[PDB]
Amino acid sequence: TYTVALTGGIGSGKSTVADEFAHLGVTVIDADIIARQVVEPGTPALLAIAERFGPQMINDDGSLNRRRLRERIFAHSEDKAWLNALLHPLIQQETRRQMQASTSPYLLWVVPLLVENRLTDKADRILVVDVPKETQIERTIRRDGVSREHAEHILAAQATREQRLAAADDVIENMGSADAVASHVARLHDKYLMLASQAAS
Numbered sequence: 001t002y003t004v005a006l007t008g009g010i011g012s013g014k015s016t017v018a019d020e021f022a023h024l025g026v027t028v029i030d031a032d033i034i035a036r037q038v039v040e041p042g043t044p045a046l047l048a049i050a051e052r053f054g055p056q057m058i059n060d061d062g063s064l065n066r067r068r069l070r071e072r073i074f075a076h077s078e079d080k081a082w083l084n085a086l087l088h089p090l091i092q093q094e095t096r097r098q099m100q101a102s103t104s105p106y107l108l109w110v111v112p113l114l115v116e117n118r119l120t121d122k123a124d125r126i127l128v129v130d131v132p133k134e135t136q137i138e139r140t141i142r143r144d145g146v147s148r149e150h151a152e153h154i155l156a157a158q159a160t161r162e163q164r165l166a167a168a169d170d171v172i173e174n175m176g177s178a179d180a181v182a183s184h185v186a187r188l189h190d191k192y193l194m195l196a197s198q199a200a201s
């Protein structure tokens, strides 16, 4: 199936761009979303976490207390292997279920570390969501509650903005009016539709 990889640095707003494609009927595969889905309230995976580490892993609303789980892994690195063994098969299975259930002309894959992990060959096209470096820092501080210095360190550990732009087939700047960004998405959607038809012929 024709696949577009959506990449971008921290704080770029990849998910708001991906949502626009989803609104146009595109199947969006996002491993971070799938990871949260497999531990949602009532899931067997969440129960396994609670039965091992305790009921404090479940908030009053039935959801995973993510900070408590991060604290457990921080104190007991051995528990990272147990968590991966529990969750990785579920994420892989749900990823494949969503792929197989798709009926859209192409798939949009949200890939956080495409350039870092050097995956810029497996998708048919690469779409980079770009913002200025200061915009990344500002948005990461707000969403994640980190210092500017922390945000700068994360940027240092990721591919450079220039590397991402260099690898991109298309660039969408997640800046300015939201309506114009949505219009930009619709323009790219048509491009991908025609490319998917070309590939199928």
Ligand SMILES: Nc1ncnc2c1ncn2[C@@H]1O[C@H](COP(=O)(O)OP(=O)(O)NP(=O)(O)O)[C@@H](O)[C@H]1O
Pocket (backbone or CB within 6 Å): 008, 009, 010, 011, 012, 013, 014, 015, 016, 017, 112, 139, 140, 142, 143, 174, 175
């Ligand atoms: N156009 C925008 N203007 C302002 N804030 C935005 C915009 N688009 C997204 N955001 C915010 O920026 C933050 C990052 O967006 P999100 O889509 O969650 O990031 P991501 O790039 O998908 N993931 P990550 O690598 O972890 O940052 C969120 O708090 C969004 O609400």
